[PDB]
Amino acid sequence: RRKKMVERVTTLMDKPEFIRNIGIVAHIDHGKTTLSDNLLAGAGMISKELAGEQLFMDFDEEEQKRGITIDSANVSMVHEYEGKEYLINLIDTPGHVDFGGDVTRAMRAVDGAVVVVDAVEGAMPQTETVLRQALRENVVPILFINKVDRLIMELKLTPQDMQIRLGAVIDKINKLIKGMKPDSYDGLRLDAAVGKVAFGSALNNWAISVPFMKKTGIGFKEVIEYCMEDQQQKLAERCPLHAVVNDMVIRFLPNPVQAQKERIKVIWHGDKGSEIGKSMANVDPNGKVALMITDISTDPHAGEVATGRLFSGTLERGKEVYISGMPNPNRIQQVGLFMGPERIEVDRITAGNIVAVTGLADAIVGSTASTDKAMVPFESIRHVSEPVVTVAVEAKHMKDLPKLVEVLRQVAKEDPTLKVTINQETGEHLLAGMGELHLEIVAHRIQRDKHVEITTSKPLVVYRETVSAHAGPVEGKSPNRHNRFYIEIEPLQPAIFELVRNGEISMKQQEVERRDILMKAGMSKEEAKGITHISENNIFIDMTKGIQYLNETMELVLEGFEEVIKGGPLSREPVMGLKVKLMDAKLHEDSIHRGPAQVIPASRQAIQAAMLMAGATLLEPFQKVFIHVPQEQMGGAMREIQGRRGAILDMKTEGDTTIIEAKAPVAQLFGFAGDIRSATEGRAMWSTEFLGFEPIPANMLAETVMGIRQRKGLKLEMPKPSDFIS
Ligand SMILES: Nc1nc2c(ncn2[C@@H]2O[C@H](COP(=O)(O)OP(=O)(O)CP(=O)(O)O)[C@@H](O)[C@H]2O)c(=O)[nH]1
Ligand SMILES: [Cl-]
Numbered sequence: 001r002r003k004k005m006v007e008r009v010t011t012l013m014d015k016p017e018f019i020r021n022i023g024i025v026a027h028i029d030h031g032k033t034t035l036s037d038n039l040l041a042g043a044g045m046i047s048k049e050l051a052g053e054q055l056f057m058d059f060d061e062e063e064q065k066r067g068i069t070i071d072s073a074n075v076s077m078v079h080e081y082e083g084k085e086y087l088i089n090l091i092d093t094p095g096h097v098d099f100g101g102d103v104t105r106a107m108r109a110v111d112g113a114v115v116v117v118d119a120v121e122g123a124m125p126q127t128e129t130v131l132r133q134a135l136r137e138n139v140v141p142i143l144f145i146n147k148v149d150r151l152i153m154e155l156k157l158t159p160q161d162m163q164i165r166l167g168a169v170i171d172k173i174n175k176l177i178k179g180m181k182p183d184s185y186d187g188l189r190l191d192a193a194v195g196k197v198a199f200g201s202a203l204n205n206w207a208i209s210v211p212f213m214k215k216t217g218i219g220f221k222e223v224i225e226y227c228m229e230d231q232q233q234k235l236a237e238r239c240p241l242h243a244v245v246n247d248m249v250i251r252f253l254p255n256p257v258q259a260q261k262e263r264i265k266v267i268w269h270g271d272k273g274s275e276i277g278k279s280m281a282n283v284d285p286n287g288k289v290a291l292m293i294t295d296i297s298t299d300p301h302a303g304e305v306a307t308g309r310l311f312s313g314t315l316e317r318g319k320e321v322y323i324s325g326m327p328n329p330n331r332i333q334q335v336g337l338f339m340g341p342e343r344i345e346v347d348r349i350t351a352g353n354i355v356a357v358t359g360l361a362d363a364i365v366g367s368t369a370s371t372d373k374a375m376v377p378f379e380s381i382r383h384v385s386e387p388v389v390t391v392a393v394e395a396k397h398m399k400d401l402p403k404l405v406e407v408l409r410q411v412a413k414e415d416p417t418l419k420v421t422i423n424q425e426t427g428e429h430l431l432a433g434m435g436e437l438h439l440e441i442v443a444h445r446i447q448r449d450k451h452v453e454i455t456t457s458k459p460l461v462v463y464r465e466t467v468s469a470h471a472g473p474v475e476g477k478s479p480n481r482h483n484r485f486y487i488e489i490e491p492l493q494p495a496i497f498e499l500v501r502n503g504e505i506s507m508k509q510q511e512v513e514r515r516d517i518l519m520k521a522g523m524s525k526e527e528a529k530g531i532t533h534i535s536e537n538n539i540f541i542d543m544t545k546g547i548q549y550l551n552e553t554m555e556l557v558l559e560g561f562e563e564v565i566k567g568g569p570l571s572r573e574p575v576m577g578l579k580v581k582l583m584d585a586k587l588h589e590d591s592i593h594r595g596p597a598q599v600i601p602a603s604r605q606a607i608q609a610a611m612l613m614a615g616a617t618l619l620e621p622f623q624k625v626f627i628h629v630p631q632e633q634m635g636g637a638m639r640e641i642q643g644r645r646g647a648i649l650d651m652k653t654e655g656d657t658t659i660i661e662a663k664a665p666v667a668q669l670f671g672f673a674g675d676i677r678s679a680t681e682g683r684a685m686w687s688t689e690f691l692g693f694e695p696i697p698a699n700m701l702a703e704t705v706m707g708i709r710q711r712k713g714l715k716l717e718m719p720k721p722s723d724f725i726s
């Protein structure tokens with residue numbers, strides 16, 4: 001019965017000791033979703049298709065012909081270990097690089113990770129990505145080597161060849177961890193003997209581990225015989241997949257009691273000795289509320305659902321919380337937990353749990369909900385990759401113009417790695433995302449779920465603007481000519497750029513804490529001390545001496561900074577990589593003369609003129625491309641990538657197969673999937689990995705800038721410094 005399950009989960013909810021919050025991560029197609037569905041079945045939970053909310057849902061044959069996971073799915077299992085019941089919360093995540101946003105949002109909510117590796121392919125590009133994403137969040141990883149059934153029969157190899165090849169995978173994962181966090185590699189290391197690694201077949205519901213093997217007697221000899229004599233069904237009775245893997249989850253992944261104090265080191269810049277600081281570290285149900293929202297979605301009946309991680313306190317219907325950056329308190333309607341594949345309403349929820357909540361009218365992804373309005377909010381959920389592809393979207397019928405604006409707004413709310421620009425003048429809206437497939441899925445769902453016929457344009461790349469040298473001081477001047485600002489500008493140093501990109505500094509930190517981090521990474525003491533604003537991948541530094549009225553005028557200066565960052569002076573593309581320094585300023589004494597109408601245009605104009613004096617340039621995004629190919633088709637694949645402005649970084653040969661490691665610009669990778677096939681008689685297997693932005697060749701700057709200004713309908717003239725400081 002489901003009668004019994006509800007009481008079991010509700011009981012365990014109040015016992016943080018017996019909770020595991022975990023995510024399943026892997027390179028695409030390595031077996032994440034087969035593993036999640038079959039752990040859920042072995043535990044005795046009902047399957048997703050029989051869920052109450054799914055009764056009236058047809059199986060769209062197009063979205064499931066690819067079978068690819070597109071969105072994260074939350075489930076929970078009750079599992080019995082050494083005579084005690086544990087609540088395991090699980091998040092199954094997408095593999096495809098275009099949906100890496102869902103992976104970062106999931107890592108924010110869990111405390112442990114099962115990394116799945118294909119025994120045939122071994123470790124692949126996104127195996128590195130997901131491992132890095134977990135360690136950045138202080139999540140503990142363990143290893144499950146999958147598809148071992150395919151390794152045995154397709155390769156017809158020795159038992160000793162099987163020990164070697166599987167140890168080869170374990171070694172590769174250990175090297176990645178050592179490189180990524182050398183200080184604590186001794187603690188995170190995966191040892192096979194203790195039980196931190198498991199092997200099996202998710203598809204066929206068996207798995208083995210060393211503590212289980214000696215506690216059972218089965219050897220590698222018996223495992224090979226089972227698979228070659230067509231008896232994998234009997235190997236699953238002796239070594240059940242959920243038994244081995246759920247025991248390992250309970251034995252080596254942390255409960256909220258051991259892990260919440262380590263998560264808060266990287267996700268919160270508040271006082272760790274404060275009331276909320278230690279009550280989060282205590283998983284204290286009687287503390288103030290601290291709710292970390294990681295997902296927004298919509299329910300046909302209940303409305304909007306906010307999902308995330310409760311770190312301190314209790315929630316129930318009618319309790320009021322503030323949303324970070326919003327003035328009015330929101331009131332809770334329903335609180336719920338995931339039990340199997342369903343979301344069920346409970347009377348109360350407590351710290352330590354993954355929770356779902358309705359009524360928070362102002363919630364968004366990354367929000368903090370708290371009892372006290374003044375709590376320092378949790379760090380943002382940063383995806384380490386910016387949007388690089390854009391299409392224009394228009395409603396097919398003009399009678400649908402408002403509904404499409406509504407539909408597009410909810411869509412960007414639910415997936416924040418999308419950027420939506422709405423233009424109710426032209427009726428044409430830009431939609432920017434991580435790749436062509438990302439945009440394809442968005443368009444297909446607006447037309448299928450929201451019932452709004454749309455037309456989309458051909459995809460185009462999204463550039464960035466930056467500077468290449470130092471310039472200044474440059475003077476910006478308010479329209480009434482009373483206020484003046486003196487600005488220098490130059491590129492961020494790469495070490496400082498990484499601190500900003502990784503969220504290791506913020507203006508929420510204590511001053512001495514932030515300054516020591518900056519100085520340890522190169523910055524002079526005076527610049528570390530004067531930093532006042534961090535936006536995107538740029539910083540603003542106040543170097544002034546002590547100017548009356550500057551402090552209350554600074555927010556207006558920073559709004560001018562932000563307007564330039566949203567679209568730069570070459571082509572109105574987003575800006576990255578700047579260190580902007582305020583060296584001096586003249587201000588009028590009367591507030592009526594130094595308001596928004598005067599300060600924002602002067603700040604805006606000094607920054608834009610300094611940029612054009614500092615060698616402004618465009619950057620275009622580049623991908624790293626891995627091409628697996630048989631010897632015969634090597635030359636074909638080589639020509640095809642070098643004909644798309646591709647450069648070869650390395651080449652590796654294992655027997656008959658060569659792996660080509662190249663880099664190429666996004667702008668030239670449209671149509672690659674079908675061109676790489678027609679060029680390698682269909683044998684090429686490839687994957688990508690975002691590399692970075694690189695400057696466009698100085699001979700291509702003016703052509704590229706003018707083409708963007710054309711497409712955007714701006715004046716077809718190169719900007720000069722005299723256009724701003726006038
Ligand atoms: N032979 C074999 N095939 C398996 C095993 N586990 C999964 N597969 C197969 O691999 C393919 C992908 O499995 P799936 O669970 O969807 O992997 P995924 O990592 O979730 C795919 P995505 O990254 O898109 O979310 C399927 O065809 C599935 O049947 C296994 O243990 N053995
Ligand atoms: Cl710097």
Ligand SMILES: [Mg+2]
Nearest residue numbers: 032033068069
């Ligand atoms: Mg999947």
